[PDB]
Amino acid sequence: TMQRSSDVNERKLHVPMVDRTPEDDPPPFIVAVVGPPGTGKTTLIRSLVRRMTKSTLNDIQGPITVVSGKHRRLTFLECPADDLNAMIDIAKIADLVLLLIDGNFGFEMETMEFLNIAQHHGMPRVLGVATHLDLFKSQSTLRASKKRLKHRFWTEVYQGAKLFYLSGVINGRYPDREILNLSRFISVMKFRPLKW
Amino acid sequence: SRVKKRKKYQKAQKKLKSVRAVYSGGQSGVYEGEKTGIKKGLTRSVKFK
Amino acid sequence: AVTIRTRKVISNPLLARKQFVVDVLHPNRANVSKDELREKLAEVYKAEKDAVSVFGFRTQFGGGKSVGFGLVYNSVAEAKKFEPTYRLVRYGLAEKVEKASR
Amino acid sequence: YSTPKRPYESSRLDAELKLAGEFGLKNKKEIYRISFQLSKIRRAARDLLTRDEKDPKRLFEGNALIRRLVRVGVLSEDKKKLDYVLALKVEDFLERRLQTQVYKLGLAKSVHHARVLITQRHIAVGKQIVNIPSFMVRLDSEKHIDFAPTSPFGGARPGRVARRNAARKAE
Amino acid sequence: AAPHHWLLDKLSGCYAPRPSAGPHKLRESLPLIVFLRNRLKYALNGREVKAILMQRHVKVDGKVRTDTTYPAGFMDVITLDATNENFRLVYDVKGRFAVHRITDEEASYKLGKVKKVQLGKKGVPYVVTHDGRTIRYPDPNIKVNDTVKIDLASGKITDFIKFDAGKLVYVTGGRNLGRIGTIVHKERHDGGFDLVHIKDSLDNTFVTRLNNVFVIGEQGKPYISLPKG
Amino acid sequence: NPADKRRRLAKQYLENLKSEDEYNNFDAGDLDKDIIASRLKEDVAEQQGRVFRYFGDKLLISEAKQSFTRVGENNLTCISCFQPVRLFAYTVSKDLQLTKYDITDFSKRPKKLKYAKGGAKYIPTSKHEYENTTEGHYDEILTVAASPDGKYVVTGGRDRKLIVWSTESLSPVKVIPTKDRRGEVLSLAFRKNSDQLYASCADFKIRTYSINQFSQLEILYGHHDIVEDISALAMERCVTVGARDRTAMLWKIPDETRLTFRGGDEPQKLLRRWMKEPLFFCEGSIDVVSMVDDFHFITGSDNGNICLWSLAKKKPIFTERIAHGILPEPSFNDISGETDEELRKRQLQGKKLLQPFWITSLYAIPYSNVFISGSWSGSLKVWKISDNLRSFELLGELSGAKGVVTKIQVVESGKHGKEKFRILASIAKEHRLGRWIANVSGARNGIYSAVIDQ
RNA sequence: GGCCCAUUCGGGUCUUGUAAUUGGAAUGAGUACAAUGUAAAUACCUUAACGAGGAACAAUUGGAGGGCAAGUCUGGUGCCAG
């Protein structure tokens, strides 16, 4: 087990860089919800802020900063889905990315373009969120496309990123069980410092 | 994986006709002749010791 | 054309009932077609179509045969008494839903 | 199954080449599986020879082993001796599979035609359609390998290609 | 989770039915659910055996006693009204509950081993049995381990079988549980291994206790009918 | 001694398995199952009926009224009869004709009623194996079977069809093909007092049908040559025999399981058994059956054996080696082609090429004590089975049937102690499957009826 | 013309090839009627309809060796060597 201990203790070592993020009052972590036009986003930002702050925030606009932890607060904003320019800007400044994927349609070039722009400008943390799981009667094809989306997402982010599965929308927004443990995934993310 | 071994066995048993002389099944029709030549100088037989 | 075979027919006077095992035979058909099977069972035995019932269907591999469990009643009222409520929901007339809470 | 001792010597490679080509096998795992359990069989029969005559183990397990080997069909009815179990080998075992047997009975034109007939379900031993090619038919199921009655090579209704061509030629 | 006496197949379930309290003990009885449902199979599940218990077909010991876990112990004559089912259940030779079918003149009574005779209160002689039928006034010569015959319409003792050397005895208990033949030997010790010993096909010998044995008749004439093979 | 050690160790083994008559002998599970047996219904079809008609020596034999009604049909093949609880009979030929008879006029020859003749008109216009739904026979009808209730006769042959005809008009009500290329039917038997037919088809297959529902019940597989004969009684068991695999199987048809019975007579041990002090030998092909009762049956072989088999013994209980004689050897003017009788006698090799007659028809009267065997020896034989059911014995012969006997069965008359039967036997000059038969010695294509009495 | 052997010269052998055309059969993944199963639903089992030519309905991984330019670089006893 000594060779295992050496080969595992080796991959703790990384390039020692500075942090430059304070520990007393850190800024609210910028969460960017990124999707092609027609999936999640609004409904998703509304559901997350309703679970987080007990406040029905109908008709969102702009960045939305809420407190979601004892010391972690975070800022919600949404890219306009047609603009590559706003896509590029929030790729360059976002810290967490909720990557909306229409799981019925599949992968799409807007989320692929965001993934490549982020990968070249300093890849932030990415949690993929696959919606539209109303495929057919076939729970078999639900599971098949589930696995295929997870593997294709794993080739674009590190192998072992989190793809999250949202069920159908019920009464204007998502199921609060799913949004509860989605916020449980957002609450532990352990951000690492970028360079730019 | 199956068609590859079907077509590398057909290649192998076409190469086997080159090294040995393969029993093809006997005389087909009328004995036409040797069809390829008769060498009177070559003896392809294994001598002892 | 489906084919029917009853085997091991016993009588239960305590439950006012006659029960047996049902070899159902459908060469080049899909399966048992349970309502049509209750029709065929109710005409091979006496009338009592809302008092004949089958529940335990297992088709063997490759089709053709299926073994079920057949029980036929006299007196449709006492059949309604003695049969369970889920089979009554499946076949007959009863429908009471459970209160959906917690 | 289990891999052999020296898996890459040239005699073994030409061996597997001849076996896979002569029996239409897909990879090495067919040979290795059937040879692994044949190794268990004749490794047992070796010990049954190393014990003596009138040993209870030898008498009962020997006639048991040769009778169930005869009923699998790799051993003929007259050789009821225990040294023929040692003379047994791997192609005596994979001549018994259904692909080999369909081709030898002549329902197919080659072992590859036999493999695709079996995997397209045109072949039924007895009552059930068998659909895997490595089936190890027995000496009683040897003569009921025939075309399935659910199949156009039996007597059934012709398939989608034939009926679509018939419909388009009727148009 | 089952005993050995019930003849219970293992492919049945997980929870075994504990009998409720009643006449006999837990360890020497079978309830009605394990009787009717999975032994002679008048039911298929607990719901319909409760259904026929609510219909009240059972007439064990001449009373109805509608209960699922009612502990029918030794020779309680189970009576079922439809198809005049009269069942006296005794022990077989390998420990189970062999339920013999009898007729009406035999199910009109039962018998019971007397346990103790008491001068309880107000000058009343007194007798108990394995179902606890406290019936009034037997003769003074009722020793322990004799056999009363209950009336089963009223409760009175009708006949009496005296326990002595040369009586046909039934053994329910210990490693002799369920044997018949009652004569090779008599040996009353002073506190244990005390009994009358029982023959076999080759007239072998056996040891038991007094309380684990009780008389059913005479050498050739028991008025109980017994099953055979 | 190794087989002695095998027997000894097997005996010790069974003793140890027993290890792992008293006055009380009752077992709880047995008596509980007997209570369920008292509870159940249908003690009707499943009688394990033993031999309850012990009358073999009783009736007369030697003075039967034998009428050989010759008919003008080449090579009659089968015979089907009927009795309710007027009697009709049925014959069928290689000339593609079914013929209905009345037989109930017992003291005289049968009476022709109705033809039904297929021919070249009924060849299907497809040559395709599942549109074989024509209304007549175009090739070689091999077997007829009358219903036990008498609504239908059902027949079939080498055109791989089952045509079920009505009785009152001889009309084809329904056609059921056997859906494959080799599916020629060779034997048909209804189970008694029923509407269920058991056909034995040359695909090593046994098909079963319900005739009044026009449905097929179950196909059951397992012989190794063509299933040359079939037999059934009131039970849902059946007994088939395939030809050259030398085994007879009996089928629990609901369970779809079987009991096999192989032959196994060897001239080495048989000639040694005679050598302890002889022209008898091994076996060719088990050919015909009839289930005598629900525990025994009898098989007719290709070397003239008649064998009696139980339900509880693999090897047969009783044999009878030569049952119709050995054939007349080919003449010296038709063996050799030399001039002198010495060389033409040397071309007979003595006794080495004398072949026995093969029993081509066997009929056990159901549950009775007597069965009838027939071949082309010219004389039917009647045998009775002894009352201990471990042997049979030749009673007498019925010598008015010149030709091959392609079918035997009997027709009953008279009450419980006084009885008379007419034995029908289809007589041809050619075996019912192929030709193969030379030296046609005065044969005629007829119906040999005999009236036996007392 | 392909193939095989061999350090060399050479030797041994034989129906073998081709992004050549072409033909009708087969069905399986998939898409799906159902019924069965089951408290109910899933799944197994049974199963009509559609479903192949780049059968594109588009399996990988690793290895061995070339060949090319009005191209580029280095060396130096022309046109070469690398």
Ligand SMILES: Nc1nc2c(ncn2[C@@H]2O[C@H](COP(=O)(O)OP(=O)(O)OP(=O)(O)O)[C@@H](O)[C@H]2O)c(=O)[nH]1
């Ligand atoms: N069936 C289904 N519909 C959904 C789901 N999520 C969102 N929608 C629908 O998506 C519709 C489009 O509005 P939004 O989802 O807010 O659109 P968006 O994702 O913000 O994208 P933009 O239109 O570009 O702003 C809504 O009216 C929802 O009904 C889901 O999981 N299932």
Ligand SMILES: [Mg+2]
């Ligand atoms: Mg939006």
